[PDB]
Structures are given as structure tokens and as C-alpha cells.
Amino acid sequence: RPPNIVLIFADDLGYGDLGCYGHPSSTTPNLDQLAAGGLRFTDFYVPVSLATPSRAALLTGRLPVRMGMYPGVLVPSSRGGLPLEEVTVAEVLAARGYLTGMAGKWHLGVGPEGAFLPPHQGFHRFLGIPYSHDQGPCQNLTCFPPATPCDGGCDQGLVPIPLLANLSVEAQPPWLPGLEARYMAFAHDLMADAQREDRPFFLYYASHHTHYPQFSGQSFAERSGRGPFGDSLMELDAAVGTLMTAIGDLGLLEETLVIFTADNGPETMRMSRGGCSGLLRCGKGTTYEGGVREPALAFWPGHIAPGVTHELASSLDLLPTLAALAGAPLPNVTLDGFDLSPLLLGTGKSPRQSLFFYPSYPDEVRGVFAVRTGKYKAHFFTQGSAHSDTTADPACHASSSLTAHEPLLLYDLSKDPGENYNLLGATPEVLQALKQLQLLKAQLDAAVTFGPSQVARGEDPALQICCHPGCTPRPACCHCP
Amino acid sequence: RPPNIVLIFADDLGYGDLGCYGHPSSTTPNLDQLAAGGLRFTDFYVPVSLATPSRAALLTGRLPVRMGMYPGVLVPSSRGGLPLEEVTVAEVLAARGYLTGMAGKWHLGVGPEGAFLPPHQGFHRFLGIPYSHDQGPCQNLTCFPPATPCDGGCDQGLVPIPLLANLSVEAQPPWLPGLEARYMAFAHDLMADAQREDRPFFLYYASHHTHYPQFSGQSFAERSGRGPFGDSLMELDAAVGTLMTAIGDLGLLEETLVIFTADNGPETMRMSRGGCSGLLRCGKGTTYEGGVREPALAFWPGHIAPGVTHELASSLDLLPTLAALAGAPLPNVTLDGFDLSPLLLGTGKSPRQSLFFYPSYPDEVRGVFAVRTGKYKAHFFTQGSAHSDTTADPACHASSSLTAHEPLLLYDLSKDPGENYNLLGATPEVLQALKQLQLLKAQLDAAVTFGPSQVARGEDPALQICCHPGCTPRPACCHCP
Ligand SMILES: *[C@H]1O[C@H](CO)[C@@H](O[C@H]2O[C@H](CO)[C@@H](O)[C@H](O)[C@H]2NC(C)=O)[C@H](O)[C@H]1NC(C)=O
Ligand SMILES: *[C@H]1O[C@H](CO)[C@@H](O[C@H]2O[C@H](CO)[C@@H](O)[C@H](O)[C@H]2NC(C)=O)[C@H](O)[C@H]1NC(C)=O
Ligand SMILES: [Mg+2]
Ligand SMILES: [Mg+2]
């Protein structure tokens, strides 16, 4: 039968944050053990280094511009959302009869009467926050018990963060030192109900770690030895340990595929309360490797042998791989990913040779910003971001503005993953890579027409979720902790 | 009985070059397996990030300025050398009756009739090159067989590189695609003779990898998928695999302690033919973490359990640990390291709380440049280096000149290992760290008197080794390949 699937997606976590990706001070013992008994990717990517667009791509296997998920990210007042018409992974697995569930951050739209909420896009069960946890004021929230407050305040002028159960406000705001526990219990129940009914489950655990502001429950506060960002990552790692114990307990180890990855690179503007891209350059919000190249682990005892692949892979390849693996059929839409099951099961290579990267603010005159083929990556356009400010590398700062490069900038990632030495600063291998990259951009730009933007549909304060509907004064009357 | 000891010391290799320290493209399967069954350090250091001074410190357990090993490094014409009077590790183990042997780079002086060569400082056996392999012309050497030449030429105006056997020129220059093989065989014989005579051996394998220029034998050329720097590191890794097979073969696994580390950070001026410091800042020649913080593995089946320590350690601590472990007595000299055996054997903590860092060009008016206590590191002086040029971080370049900092620059390495956020840009933990660091520098600077420099004793071309003594014209007549 099709396997049970657990998909864990961390938030704003970098390529060099796990212990097993080199960090000297992180504490992530469950993830290290999951890498030690599974496949660790060195070259897995996401196509855009922001939250919404990354989350859309993972769930539909489709580049975000195809469906209007740009520019920037959605906010609480947002009129727009991932069209209902797109077929998510949960829609696909639901129809093969999976009990589907999601815990955590959705950030894929809310809408008039919550029409874009997960329960409309194929999850049977949903306990979570519908957008990032810092999108609503937090100067009064506790981030670390007993009463260490969240740092800095978060977004102002908005309803507190709502924890939701399907479409109902279960709390507003929730108590952050307790979210993990709520989420483990929801996960545990979903698994056990699925055993109960003889059916495979699909759990989508989209953690809030390690997005700003950092938080954790008391068993982690001040125990990772890397400060708040670590306490928070140690908690995500202990949630993973929990899912894994529960998989043990129900005797489901060899029947569950478990993937871990993250939506985008670190927010280095948070300084030492943000993540680390390791040897890679820059972070969140850019098309440099540090923003789009993420950690990725695939673990399935008895099906995937412990190792390290350098094959190309993308979050875009998850719907199709999982569809394949569960004998479910693919939507009748154009897809930008591929089935990676041969690579997972060790009977093949990855079919993916290229990757296309779009910036946070794309546009049809400029098209794709960077393309990777084999070991080479070309950048046609370059640009820093305020999510990546504060590091010593000036190309990452928001003062590095949009600059065009013709001839393109060319890096061989196998020797210069750090993207330091432009090879066009000659050889025949180089001229052949340049001609291929130039043609893959012109091909893609000529063939993709952007979907009309969801984010420019604007904002309506009246779409903000409220615990005490119709109350007054808005937004402070919404609440019910 | 005291264990057999193998000490492997790589050259110009960075903290993020091993596969197990995060690199995405290196191929180092034996070292990864050695980490997987042993202790991987995250915070091991060397006190100066140049070759000579690092090599002096490791062998004597003493800060290089105590014995005149500054500034810069020794050259072939150098009149000076590590005084005979210093007691090396090999001297110490010899007197407890170890069969002692060294293969590889010595760079600790040559002298009039080779008075500073290893055979005078306690090794019974020596097959190697007495200084770096690029210190003599290489435009005509082959670096990768069948006939790929070394890149760039190396040093000019000098005798070719001599391979030596005790004090005799066995070759000049040697064939670089064959060094590994010579070195494995010498190592194999030394082990097996030591079994034969019922005595513990001490092998000091100081590889030439991954110093410029890169080279390897044909089984590695073009097979690591990271280019020449990788082919070269893949060869060092396959030498490690060989030592390990040989340890197996003689049935010596649980009686041999094996340590791996490297003398100093990467030479990023070699660009993509140089190493990678990972998330750490800068490289070779600086007192930033990327120049002084090195990979370090301790492997001893049945004595050291597989893990990861974050305890402080230094190359300075090796003589005393090994002396302890072999029940040999310590020289009657002031030592700057400590016995780490409790940490190795899991019955203790490291005794080391502080580390003192000197620059490549030290002086008694300025004294130590950086000090680490617990998780904090202070920099009293900062400075870039031409060994670290070419990266995006401007503080590493040789155009960043010697700048004093009062108040000191203060970093908490557990949250900011990358040395980005000066904490003095307030708190009581901070003021207490500042006062302690300021006092550890003034204490050390007032108590260490520098030894008179060996390197300023000057140069005599006549000290250059010659295969065909008395020939003419010097230096090209020296040779005998
Ligand atoms: C809200 O929606 C779902 C689905 O209706 C709730 O559903 C589940 O709850 C019970 C068992 O866990 C059963 O009464 C329902 O059959 C079951 N539904 C399915 C399809 O499994 C759920 O409790 C709410 N979501 C969550 C967990 O918050
Ligand atoms: C040069 O010096 C050493 C020591 O004299 C040589 O010594 C070893 O060689 C033989 C066995 O390997 C024996 O004849 C000697 O007893 C032995 N010496 C010791 C003390 O072990 C050695 O071959 C030369 N160095 C090397 C290996 O190059
Ligand atoms: Mg995100
Ligand atoms: Mg060196």
C-alpha cells in the first residue's frame, strides 16, 4: 500500500543551521539521527526565497508566478490567496484516500470567510496559524516561559495572531510556549485515527520555527547552547523526535516516508537571533545560494539507504514524487517538477538537470534571475535584500540594488559553492555552459506567462480574523486567549 | 601498555572542507567514517595561522613566540630553526621507548648540515620534504599525471624541492603523483617493524595536502567532484583509509589512538583551488575564527566513544595529553597546553577555559591580538592578510590594515561563530566577560618574554640542500630526480 507520509517544513532555516550541516553550536540530535539513517541532500533547492511563494510551490509543484503568488508575501488583510483551482498535494492524496492533516503556518491566503484556508485545499484536519506568527503585535506575548517576552513587537495595527481549528478561532492569540505540545497531540491523533481506519495518513507539519520571533516551551528555553534561535531550533528538533517516537509506537516505521526541508534561507537581519547559510552566500530574499538552497532529509527505513546525494532536487519535485510513490495520478496541469523516486530508492538518477530561480519581486520584462544547469549557475540579474542585511558581504544588503549582468555572472558550484569567482571575469566547457544557460532562460521566459497577481488584489482590514466577531474597537477587541 | 599513536596533520585545510563539517562537494569518506566512530571537535584551535609557528606549537606544546618561531615562516635559505633544546613530542615518546617516525612536511628549519632536521628532534625515521612543497620552482613539475603541470610556478630562484630520507636527498625533486604511495609504504613499514619489536609506534604524518600547488596520484586526479583542491583532499582522505586498513591488518585497532587536525586556515587567495572556512570568517594568516579554528577528530575504538564535543581544545594540548596517555613524563619547561585525556575518555571536562591568539607578525608592544574565554572572544587588534584575499569580506583582505580596538571587539561565539555582531557596539554578563578578557591579555603579555627571532637570523643561499653537492651552476644543478 502507499506509505504514510510526514512532510516537515521549517521556516527561515538555513543551509548551515543543522548539526549535521556543520553548525558548531546548534543542538539538533533527532535531525542528525534522521540524516545518519537516511538520505541527506547537499543540493536541494526552493525556487523563490520568501515564505508564500515557497509554500505555494511545494504544495502545487508549480512555479509561483504561474498562479499569481508574487510579489512579496500575503498579509492578514490580504484579499488574495492561492486559487482554489490549483491542485495541492493534499487534494491529490485525499483522492487516493489518505487521511490528510496539517499543523502550523499556512501563509497561503485567508480570504472572505476563510475561503483559502487549508480545509478548502484538501486537508481533512487543520490546527494552525494562517500566516507567520509575527504578523500581529507581540510586545505583550510571552516567547519563553515563564515570562520572557517576544523581542521587538512584530507587526502593528493588526488583530492578534489567531490559532485556528479548521475554520474556527480556537485562541487569539495562542500561548507560544505551548504550541509545540498542541501540535504534537494533533499529529499523534491524526496518525492513530488513520491506523484505526486502515488508511495511510499524510501529515504536513509546517513549523513556526525558526521564524522571528523566536519562542519555545520551558523544556528548551535556555538549553540549546546557541541562545534563543537555538532554543527554538532544539524545540523543532524535539518535535521531530516526537513524531518519530509516535511512528515507532504505532509500529509504522517501515511504512512511513519522512521528509524534512525549509521554505527559504535565513533572515540575517535578525542577526544572532536568525539562521546561518554556512559557506553559502547571503540569505532570505535573494537568489544567491544561501537563500534558495535548503537542508533536506528523506528517511524511510528499509526503502532508502543511508547516504549523501549531490543530485539536483527541488521542493517543486515533491508533489510528483509523492503522487508516484502513492500510485496517485497527477493533476492535468503543467508541472515544473519531476518524480525523484528512483533517486530516493536507489535505482536511478535524478531526472532534474536545471533549476530556475525568481526573485521576490519578479516581472515579465526581466524574467528569471538565475539558472542552474549541472554544476554551473548563471545570474542574469543580482540584488540584495533587507532580509539579508547586516552581514559583512555587501552584495547581500538592501543597498545592493537590482543590477543586470550581460555577459551573465558564471559560477561553478562544485568548486565555488560560495559564489565568489566569476568564471567569465574562455574555455570551451565554459562557452558551452554559457550558451546553454542563455537558452534555458530565453526558453523559459518565452514560455511562462505570469498569473495575475494575488498580492496586488489589495487589502481589506475587514478580512482580518476576529475571535469576538462584530466587537469594537477593532483590532484590539479581537481576542480570546 | 601505552597506545600506538598516529597524528595526521593536514596543511592549509579549513574548518568547512571535510564532508562531515558540512562541505557540499568534498569527497572525504574515510574521514567521515572516522568522525562517525569517534570524537569530532567543533571548537578545536591552533594559536597562530601560519605553517611554521603552528608546527612548532603542536610539537612542543608551547606558544611559538617563546622560542623565536616568528615572524612569517622559514624558507630554504633560512639560517634559523626550532632550537635543539626544545623538547618535541617525539623526544618525549622516544624516551618511553616508542619507535618514532615522521613522513611529510617539516618546515621547522634545515640549517648548516641539516642540524634542525627531524632526525635531530627525536624521530628515528623520516621520509619527507623539509618545508612547503611550493618553496622551489614548479613550472616544470607534474601535479596531476599523466602530464598536467603544477599551476603557477611556485617560488623562484631556488633549488628544487628535495625529498629526504633522514639526512639524505633521496630525490630532487620528487614526482608529486607518487608521494602518497611513498608515504604509505614508509608508514606501513614503521608500524610492522614496531609490532615486530614488541614496541608502541608514534607516526607523525604531516601531509602536503591541501597546500598549493595541488597535486595527486592518478587514482584521484579528476575524481573528487570539486576540482584540483578536491582531488588533492580525496587523496589525503585515501591516505587515511590506508593507514586505517594497515591498522586493521596488524590487529592494532583498539591499541591505536588516531588524531586528525590541520595547521591553519585556508588560503583563500588560491580562490577555488584553496579551502573553505565554512561559516567562519576569513582564513590563513588572520586571528579570525576561519584562520585558527580547525577540524579535529580523535578515534580510538573501545576507548573514545563516538560523539561531538564543544569543549575547548588546542594543538597546544597534544604533547601533554599524549605524554599522559603513554605514562611519559613532561619536560621541565613551561607549557601552554593541558592534558585532555578526561575529555577524550569521557570521564571529564576539558581543563582549558581560555585561548590566546598571536598574529603572523607579533611584537612585544602589542602582545596578543585576540583571546577567547568560555564563549566570548575579544579582539584587541584586527588585521587582514594576502593569504585571505579574494573573498567578499573586506576585513579579510590585505588592504584591511592593522587596526587597534579599545574598547575591544566582543563576540559571543556560541550564537555568532561568524564574528559579525560586536556586543560592545551593557549587560552584566558582558561587562564581566570584558574585564576578564582584558585581564587575561595583560597577564599573559606581562608574563611571556618573546624568544629572539629565529626567522630574523637571516638567509644563506649556501644552506640550500643540493643533490649533487658542490656542482655548478647553483641552483639549477641541484637535482637528481
Ligand atoms: C475539524 O475538522 C475535522 C474534520 O471534520 C475534525 O475531524 C475529525 O475529528 C474526529 C476524530 O478526530 C471525527 O469526529 C471526524 O471524523 C474527524 N474527521 C476526519 C475527516 O478525520 C477535526 O477534529 C477538526 N480539525 C482538527 C483536528 O482540528
Ligand atoms: C634512515 O634512518 C633510520 C634509522 O637508522 C633507518 O632505520 C631503520 O631501518 C631499518 C628497518 O626499517 C633498520 O636497519 C634500522 O634499525 C631502522 N632504525 C630504527 C631506529 O628503526 C631508516 O630506514 C632511514 N629512515 C627512513 C625509513 O627513511
Ligand atoms: Mg519563510
Ligand atoms: Mg600551513
Swiss-Prot record, chains A, B:
Binds 1 Ca(2+) ion per subunit. It is an enzyme of class 3 (hydrolase). Changing residue 332 to S: Often found in association with a nucleotide substitution in the polyadenylation signal downstream of the stop codon; this association defines an ARSA pseudodeficiency allele found in individuals with low enzymatic activities but no clinical manifestations; no effect on activity; no effect on protein abundance; loss of N-glycosylation. Ca(2+) binds at residues 11-12, 51, 263-264. Changing residue 372 to Q: In MLD; juvenile-onset. Changing residue 309 to I: In MLD; late-infantile form. Changing residue 411 to S: In MLD; adult-onset. Changing residue 101 to R: In MLD; juvenile-onset. Changing residue 226 to C: In MLD; juvenile-onset. Glycans are attached at residues 140, 166, 332. Changing residue 232 to Y: In MLD; infantile-onset. Changing residue 372 to W: In MLD; late-infantile and juvenile-onset. InterPro entries: Alkaline_phosphatase_core_sf, Sulfatase, Sulfatase_CS, Sulfatase_N. Changing residue 359 to L: In MLD; severe. Gene3D superfamilies: 3.30.1120.10, Alkaline Phosphatase, subunit A. GO terms for molecular function: arylsulfatase activity; calcium ion binding; cerebroside-sulfatase activity; sulfuric ester hydrolase activity. Changing residue 286 to M: In MLD; loss of enzymatic activity. Hydrolyzes cerebroside sulfate. Homodimer at neutral pH and homooctamer at acidic pH. Exists both as a single chain of 58 kDa (component A) or as a chain of 50 kDa (component B) linked by disulfide bond(s) to a 7 kDa chain (component C). Interacts with SUMF1. This is Arylsulfatase A. It comes from Homo sapiens (Human). The lineage of its organism: Eukaryota, Metazoa, Chordata, Craniata, Vertebrata.
